[PDB]
Amino acid sequence: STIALSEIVSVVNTSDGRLEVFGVGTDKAVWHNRQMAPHTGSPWSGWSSLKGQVTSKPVVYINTDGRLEVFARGTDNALWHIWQTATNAGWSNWQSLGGVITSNPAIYANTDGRLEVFARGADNALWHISQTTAHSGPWSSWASLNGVITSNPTVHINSDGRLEVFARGTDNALWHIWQTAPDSNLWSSWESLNGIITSDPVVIDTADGRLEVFARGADNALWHIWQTISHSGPWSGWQSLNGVITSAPAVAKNCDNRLEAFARGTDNALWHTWQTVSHSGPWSSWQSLNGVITSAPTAVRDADGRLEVFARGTDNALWLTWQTASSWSPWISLGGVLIDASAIK
Amino acid sequence: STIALSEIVSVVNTSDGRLEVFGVGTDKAVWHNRQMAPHTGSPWSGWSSLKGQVTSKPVVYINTDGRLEVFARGTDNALWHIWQTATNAGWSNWQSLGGVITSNPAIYANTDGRLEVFARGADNALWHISQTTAHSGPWSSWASLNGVITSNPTVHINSDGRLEVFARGTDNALWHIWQTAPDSNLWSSWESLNGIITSDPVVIDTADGRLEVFARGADNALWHIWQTISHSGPWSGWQSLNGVITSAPAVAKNCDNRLEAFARGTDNALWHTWQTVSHSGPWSSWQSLNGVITSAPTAVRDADGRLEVFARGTDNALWLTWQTASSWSPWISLGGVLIDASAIK
Ligand SMILES: [Cl-]
Ligand SMILES: [Cl-]
Ligand SMILES: [Cl-]
Ligand SMILES: [Cl-]
Ligand SMILES: [Cl-]
Ligand SMILES: [Cl-]
Ligand SMILES: [Cl-]
Ligand SMILES: [Cl-]
Ligand SMILES: [Cl-]
Ligand SMILES: [Cl-]
Ligand SMILES: [Cl-]
Ligand SMILES: [Cl-]
Ligand SMILES: [Cl-]
Ligand SMILES: [Cl-]
Ligand SMILES: [Cl-]
Ligand SMILES: [Cl-]
Ligand code: NA
Ligand code: NA
Ligand code: NA
Ligand code: NA
Ligand code: NA
Ligand code: NA
Ligand code: NA
Ligand code: NA
């Protein structure tokens, strides 16, 4: 019935190589901030309001034509969205995709360019809806993929083009379900990956085409589990990455594909652990990046191939640190006053 | 009526992070070779025949479901192809897509997952054909995009999803034509980018979403030209990268997005020049990677984020060198006996 403290912004590296960050202000509007230039340490726009009135984390996704699109639950509990009219232009108005949802939305593009959105319903099953044509409306009707879930869902694509969704179940195990063909409405049954998880799951694709899922465990360590064959079962056992974490974990890939995980520690600093040597190499010990943070961190690789990490500060502004040749940069403030609007806490 | 010596293999980093290389043997069959493991320096399969009888460079492309597909002109001058039945499985038979073509095929996926293939016709115009549905046959009818071209064409996608094709014209200038909308059959007119080029052009997308085109000039230097705005004109002037090159250039992106160009030099060694500092930084002087090569080089970034470069040797085998922390590795031989099967020489 609870999860580790959430990430509170959605961030992407856009089609022109600039990071762009989306969050929620105290009066429930979505705000965004973007780099002026496609480089680590670029000046930022500052926060600009996309208006709306949201009751979930707003989640941005890039259409296959490069246009950003933000999805969020509205005050009426419908799924709403707003999109760029062109990659380097302004935004539509907020429009409703209806339904009644009870989680943050999770988004992925099918191999045919149609976005598909997954969200928990009032019945605690996973529901979904999709664009009927590539990178465009109109959208399909809502339908259910069943299950009973207790965390925000997350979706990824397999290296063979099949979407796969992960969520915590009523028993606190990690569950998943997958497309049996790309672009299709043919799905598997829900299957348990076992474990006991106390955060939303995070999923990423490895350099070698396997899904790998991360989540906080019952012992507050970071745990992970992965496909042992490219786009295929069986899965590994759950394996611990140790640490003691007090937020959801965030994961990104370095530019050499080494995975790196980030989370708040018991001292409220940002901590991280990373694969060493290569993308098949052993994980480092947890090490501190300092800061005093009041959310999970959010990690992304920028256009210079460096990881940048965003986290809310004690002042409720969004702060930022990034990799340097030697080390990491000191935390800098991007201002704003942000809230955790997660539909599941 | 001629072009600089061509690249003689087609290489990709596949859905499971392994490099895979395609070439042509002395009896006109297509052969391929792949890394066992997703890492720099992996053992290789060795050469395996995909049979066929080709009269162009064979060009591999990855469908949006991860399956490889190889395109080549047949002995009957039709476009032929062969594809993986699944990403980690075997291949179909060679099948004909008809037409009569007079260049190597150039391939890209539209944002809706449909591959589109461009090839010069008997009239020296650019013709095209596409999959009617994402990552699958059947294919459309052939049609023409007009123009009069004197090099192999190359296609890329803009950061807004619009395909764009580049080719040398009768006047030896660089010409181009583009989709006016993603996934569409609406194209612009051919427009000249001027210059005088003496190789096939090479095109790549920058980290900041601009197309940048490279080609040998009339003075045998490497020249380049780029979109000055993301997915948009106007283009820059032609600018020289200096050097004296005796093959077509090859270009790839380092894992921090710095572009790096490769070509054979006057001493028949492999030479290279790269952006320094960042993807917006100045280009280095040309420096040697040694070797004695009998083709243009072919460059690709591997699953460890390192560039690997392939080139035919004096013995007609394919040789290989890659980036190390300090330097580059000594050339090693992958064997085989390869030919330049380019439909335009
Ligand atoms: Cl607000
Ligand atoms: Cl609005
Ligand atoms: Cl509906
Ligand atoms: Cl995730
Ligand atoms: Cl540790
Ligand atoms: Cl990038
Ligand atoms: Cl600091
Ligand atoms: Cl809050
Ligand atoms: Cl042969
Ligand atoms: Cl065959
Ligand atoms: Cl036809
Ligand atoms: Cl190219
Ligand atoms: Cl020089
Ligand atoms: Cl890779
Ligand atoms: Cl050597
Ligand atoms: Cl030859
Ligand atoms: Na942008
Ligand atoms: Na980008
Ligand atoms: Na996801
Ligand atoms: Na999340
Ligand atoms: Na492969
Ligand atoms: Na790959
Ligand atoms: Na191309
Ligand atoms: Na080429």
Numbering used by the authors:
A (entry chain A), B (entry chain A): 25 to 369
Anything the authors wrote about it?
PHL, a homo-dimer lectin (~ 80.4 kDa) with subunits linked by a disulfide bridge, was characterized as a dual-specific l-fucose/d-galactose binding protein with an unusually high number of potential binding sites. PHL forms a single domain structure, which exhibits a seven-bladed β-propeller fold organized around a seven-fold pseudoaxis of symmetry. The results of biological activity assays suggest that PHL significantly affects host defense mechanisms, specifically antimicrobial effectors such as reactive oxygen species and their production.
The structure of PHL was solved using the structure of the lectin PLL from Photorhabdus luminescens. Each repeat of the PHL lectin (W-motif) consists of a four-stranded antiparallel β-sheet connected by relatively long loops. The shape of the PHL lectin monomer is a short torus, with a diameter of 45 Å and a height of 30 Å. The tunnel in the center broadens from 13 Å at the C- and N- termini side to a diameter of 18 Å on the opposite side. The overall structure of the PHL monomer is very similar to the recently determined structure of a homologous PLL lectin, with a backbone RMSD of 0.65 Å. The dimeric state of PHL shown by AUC was also seen in the crystal. A pseudo-2-fold axis of symmetry generates the dimer associated in a “tunnel to tunnel” manner, so that the C- and N-termini are exposed to the solvent. The main dimer-stabilizing element is a disulfide bridge formed between the Cys279 residues of both monomers in the loop interconnecting β-strands in repeat W6. Additional hydrogen bonds are formed by residues in the loops of all repeats except W5. Interestingly, site 2F is occupied by the Met60 side chain of the symmetry-related molecule in all structures.
